From a paper:
Phosphotransbutyrylase (phosphate butyryltransferase, PTB) plays a crucial role in butyrate metabolism by catalyzing the reversible conversion of butyryl-CoA into butyryl phosphate. During the acidogenic phase in C. acetobutylicum, phosphotransbutyrylase (PTB, E.C. 2.3.1.8) and butyrate kinase (BUK, E.C. 2.7.2.7) play crucial roles in the production of butyrate from butyryl-CoA. These enzymes also produce ATP by enzyme catalysis, and thus, they also play an important role in the energy metabolism of the organism. To understand the molecular mechanism of the butyrate biosynthesis of C. acetobutylicum, we determined the crystal structure of phosphotransbutyrylase from C. acetobutylicum (CaPTB, phosphate butyryltransferase) at a 2.9 Å resolution.
The CaPTB monomer consists of two α/β domains, which can be divided into the N-terminal domain (ND, residue Met1–Arg117 and Ser272–Lys301) and the C-terminal domain (CD, residue Thr118–Thr271). An active site cleft was formed between two domains that is known to show an open-close conformation change during substrate-binding. The asymmetric unit contains eight CaPTB molecules forming an octamer. The octamer structure of the CaPTB consists of four dimers that are connected in a caterpillar track-like arrangement. The contacts for octamerization are mediated by hydrogen bonds and salt bridges between residues including Glu181–Arg202, Lys198–Asp211 and Asp211–Arg202. The hydrophobic interactions also heavily contribute to the octamerization using residues including Leu191, Ala194 and Met195, and these residues are located mainly in α7 of the C-terminal domains in each subunit. The CaPTB dimer is formed by hydrogen bonds and salt bridge of the loop of β13– β14 and helix α8 and α10 between C-terminal domains in subunits A–B, including Lys132–Asp261 and Asp217–Lys254. Instead, we observed four sulfate ions, which were added during the crystallization procedure, at the active site cleft formed between the two domains. The sulfate ions were stabilized by hydrogen bonds with the residues Lys254, Ser279, Ser283, Thr286, and Lys228. Because the structure of CaPTB is an apo form, whereas other compared structures are complexed form with the substrate, the structural difference at the α5 and α11 might indicate that PTB undergoes an open-close conformational change upon the substrate binding.
Numbering used by the authors:
A (entry chain B), D (entry chain D): 1 to 300
B (entry chain C): -5 to 300
C (entry chain A): 1 to 301
The structure:
């Protein structure tokens, strides 16, 4: 029954507040996000980085410095590792990449000594609110995992269904997206999709229904699914769109992002705690929606 | 034994359907074989099949006298040459002068090289497979087993035709919506077990109507395939678990052993044909009973009847 | 030059009408299209197939069959070979599909005896008019070529440049879309991108400018291009978007047509004459935009 | 010497009661079998599991809890280990499998510190008493080893003949089962088959005769072996049926039990002590006979 980033933010404000640890918090756009997140009751924050620069930027943007702890680390690589150390030892619920390149940030998340590393694979989950589809649309994996095979895709699916579970979708419909809705032994997408689908059928994957392969029209639309005579629980009702690799996943996200005015957020899951990872490309509202999601997950 | 919801569940039902229909014609490849001529006589007495006897006219007529078979009830074609006799029986079939082929006094390899002849043979381009049909005490349902005799190590391309050929036989028997279970060791996808991957991809093909006129659901272990009690205690649900009509084997070892076990450890009525050719092939054996010879004819006679 | 479908259709009305052959014309939705196409003044058409099942539908829909030619062929397959023939034998300027399934219709166009074979690969181009962008956007290949290699991708590009020429873009900006804008041996798409950019440079791909690999956003948006310090004739001004394969392709196509109100049309090129291959999936006005696209490419040549 | 499960059970009662160590005793079917084993004096038992849950089940079935020892361990994974520790350290003579997935039970039996680990490959031995045949047919491996090759098959055979020795078959007749009774380079199982038959001939595999390949029928039936004119000490009189892979052997196994009034039982060997890997779908009598086998073997 949860269909909008507004009902998402509302539910966040309804639960106990959560703490985010900013990795190199000298980022002005990130702190702008931490602030409007703190005042409206979405999330708290610990700022890890250069005390003097952080405090400078905070005055400029009218952000009470006395609202937040600030662990002073001038070194950028150490500032990142300390934000993750804060979360791995449960003094914080989430990490937000700050003024660090996504590579060094992701090494720290992955640190074998103090990181958030797990048994499962790490995966990105993007979420979208469209003018044209009343339910929420989740895309995994659009960012981190390049050419994942079955071993990875199982985990990529479990990680995304955890996120739909948090948003309140009890039993979400997972469509492995391919070019065609049909087993085709020259397209290994569809073979992975058949196998995930048997896996759901037998309870090796739980808390969802998986039915692929499915082209993107068959997964989105009832009219299209009927046009090509595809039946079952997922055609025209897909909550989760499992992308076959990064190339397809990235082109889909950016088509939505650059051709639509769709409210969207994204988080990294699979780790021991949710990770927020924005770019100067993401808007303040995306950054909001992103923290907003990372919160809901961490309270589940 | 709980009661099956099919129309046809036994070989007496199978043979009475054969008899409810226009007589089909069998080309016997090398007819100078008494157990096959015994079989072919009784086929004619009881209205199951007409036969053309292809081979050495002199010995066919001798053996006919020995078994009280009335040679006026049957066209004979004189080919004293064995290799050429098997080929002729096959050519008669491919040129629609008889509906099915039977092996007589020929070695299996020769007969088969004959059926697969490039010029006069029975090739269709899809793969040829053996379907075995059994009537067990313990299940009120015909069981179909594929491939138990021909395909040795089929991969997905072959299993798809082995499945479609299965469904054609079931349809001919009278099962319009058969239930097919790709048998493996387990009921779960295991990367270290190719059978199960193959089972998954056939199952999605069934679901999207790439395979038609059936429900394919696997992998399933044999116990979940037939027993509802086993399906139940193992939490396995769906249209095939406990109700499997067709048992697709992962290979000839699995098929052969299943089959040899049923024959030497039960008294289950059984019959077998080869299909996927342009016409059904009875490939009977010195080991099969007179009853098994007859059932085999009756199966072909139905595949051809469609 | 041209920046809208309204402009494509006006400019198509400028020229002399072009005949379309409908392979199995007994199709309500395609005949509603062929009809609208004649009243507006876009195309005349030969309606090949069952003369009786065609008139029943003609009457139903309110098109006097007198304004059209009819070639009676009651066989599905023969009507489609005959459709393709009326183009191949110079009597019509493009083929569009009807009741024939897609596979049979594609055997019919690529027929060796009377077909439209050119020896160069047959590619599908899709064309988009979006609110967020003023230039027409071209997506190849989205429909036909599944996993093209460098040699099939040269042709894919060359067909698309031919189409963009016919719209009035005399130098199309071609971006080999890829996950990243940097070269990556692990991503075969980036390799083919580099190799393709090189052939543009040496004037081995003529009449256009190819620069890849480019993430879609670098190719779409001047702002995205700038913020990642990627420059050149293409980045942020891309006209043709070269999809690395059909999975990436199919998904960018359906994401546009299901989440936006962008007008679009599609033709298959790399053939002697344009081919329109339309579907229940396609709207009525995208069937039109598609017919109009073929007529512009047929007319320019 | 011993030709029936009644005889197996007479020799078990004949000698001193041994103890099952049930891995997680909160299982009605397992306790129903452990109860009938105590009654008939086939074996004692230590039940390792959730004490409270154990007793209400012992109440539900007529099990007098005073006739068993209960080691209280609520944690399923730890209950599986304690069961094995009791065997490894000689307080019991077998493990049996309760409310655990097979993966968690086998890993516990294969434990490095406290396990029943050994030199030998673990192999399953099934054992049948059929109507049509006067001797016990033993099947190996129908359950544990998936795609064994020559090295594992040698251990599967040795393990196999060791069990036959305890039944009183002094010189058992091992048939490597294949589709055909002749060599064929395109059927790997026949290569392995003559491989193994040479090792018998050379005396490398001792205490048995090994002849193959043999089709199942040649091995079973004097008639079938006579008809295809196959001779030697094994054709027509095979005691042990060495299967080519789990798929083949599971299908013989499940065909035989769901299609016949055969009685059967099975244990895992190779380990330092017999194991009883029970199934959800095993009957009461199979679980019983299976305990009986484990007891008979632990008497050797």
């Amino acid at each position: 029954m949860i269909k909008s980033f507004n009902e998402i933010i509302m539910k966040v404000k309804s639960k106990e507040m959560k703490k985010v640890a900013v990795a190199v918090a000298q980022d002005e756009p990130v702190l702008e996000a931490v602030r409007d997140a703190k005042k409206n009751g979405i999330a708290d924050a610990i700022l890890v980085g250069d005390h003097d620069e952080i405090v400078s930027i905070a005055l400029k943007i009218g952000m009470d410095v006395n609202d937040f702890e600030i662990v002073n680390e001038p070194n950028v690589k150490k500032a990142a590792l300390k934000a993750v150390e804060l979360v791995s030892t449960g003094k914080a619920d989430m990490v937000m990449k700050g003024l660090v390149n996504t590579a060094t940030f992701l090494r720290s998340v992955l640190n074998k000594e103090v990181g958030l590393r797990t048994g499962k694979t790490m995966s990105h989950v993007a979420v979208f609110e469209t003018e044209k589809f009343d339910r929420l649309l989740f895309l995994t994996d659009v960012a981190f995992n390049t050419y994942p095979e079955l071993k990875e895709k199982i985990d990529i699916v479990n990680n995304s269904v955890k996120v739909a579970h948090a948003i309140g979708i009890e039993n979400p419909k997972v469509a492995p997206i391919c070019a065609v809705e049909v087993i085709n032994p020259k397209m290994p997408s569809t073979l992975d999709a058949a196998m995930l689908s048997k896996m759901s059928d037998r309870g090796q994957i739980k808390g969802c229904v998986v039915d692929g392969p499915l082209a993107l029209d068959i997964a989105l639309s009832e009219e299209a699914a009927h046009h090509k005579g595809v039946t079952g629980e997922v055609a025209g009702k897909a909550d989760i769109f499992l992308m076959p690799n990064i190339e397809t996943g990235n082109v889909m996200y950016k088509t939505l992002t650059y051709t639509t005015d769709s409210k969207n957020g994204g988080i990294l899951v699979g780790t021991s705690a949710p990770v927020v990872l924005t770019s100067r490309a993401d808007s303040h509202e995306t950054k909001m929606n992103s923290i907003a999601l990372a919160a809901l997950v961490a309270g589940n």
